[PDB]
């Protein structure tokens, strides 16, 4: 039973937004609603990561808390790549963001950078096995500045998943590896933008943007810790 095929089976299928595509604020207040469920599904995916359950409770709370946006963003890139060849933002099959709702206020800004991730997938022609393998890493790419409460366990699991990207790349070695680790690095760079934009809409209550209790709790915790800056991303460069 092959790891890479096993990844293929657990990867979440895409949620629908179930949206009435007939306002700059509903549009955001929908995406958060959706997002909350995605995070649910990404947690079930998390539990069903080989070796993930190896990690200690806190660390799991943490890795998810820290990389959650990242994974969400990454996969949105994948969708937008496979679905419109980089052309629109595809959140769910019903909710496609074209150039018309990009002109929706507030909104141009954050969405360029969601398309820029996808742009990376375009330029690089990433295969599916590759995608899966990297995403596993994003989960293990964002960690506290002050160690991890199972640092040895981690380092092993993280390595496992790299050797795994090795196999995945070989299937399609070692001039290409560079490029993708440069992309795995530049995620923390580009996600850090969305996370900000996220915290804005969150605490500036006078924008009447809604986030489901799921997202609510994770952000309200994750917010102060990230604001001071207790977070070091594991890079390759």
């Amino acid at each position: 039973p092959t790891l890479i095929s096993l990844l293929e089976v657990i990867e979440p299928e895409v949620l629908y937004s179930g949206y009435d595509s007939t306002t700059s604020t509903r549009l955001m207040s929908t995406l958060n609603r959706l997002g909350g469920r995605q995070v649910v599904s990404a947690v079930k995916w998390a539990k069903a990561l080989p070796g993930f359950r190896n990690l200690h409770l806190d660390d799991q709370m943490t890795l998810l808390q820290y990389s959650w946006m990242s994974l969400m963003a990454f996969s949105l890139g994948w969708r937008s790549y496979k679905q419109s060849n980089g052309n629109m933002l595809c959140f769910a099959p019903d909710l496609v963001i074209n150039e018309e709702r990009m002109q929706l206020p507030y909104m141009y800004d954050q969405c360029q950078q969601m398309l820029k991730i996808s742009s990376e997938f375009v330029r690089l022609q990433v295969s599916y096995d590759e995608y899966l393998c990297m995403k596993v890493l994003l989960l293990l790419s964002t960690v506290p500045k002050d160690g991890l409460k199972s640092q040895a366990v981690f380092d092993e699991i993280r390595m496992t998943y790299i050797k795994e990207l090795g196999k995945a790349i070989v299937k399609r070695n070692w001039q290409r590896f560079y490029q993708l680790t440069k992309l795995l690095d530049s995620m923390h760079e580009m996600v850090g933008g969305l996370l900000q934009f996220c915290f804005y809409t969150f605490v500036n209550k006078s924008l009447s943007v809604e986030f489901p209790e799921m997202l609510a709790e994770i952000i309200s915790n994750q917010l102060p810790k990230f604001k001071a800056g207790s977070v070091k991303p594991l890079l390759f460069h």
Binding site: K44, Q60, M61, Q65, E217, Q222
Partner: peptide, 10 residues
């Protein structure tokens, strides 16, 4: 500290 997230892994 996040309630739902927790009850997931616990």
């Amino acid at each position: 500290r996040p309630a739902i997230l927790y009850a997931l892994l616990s």
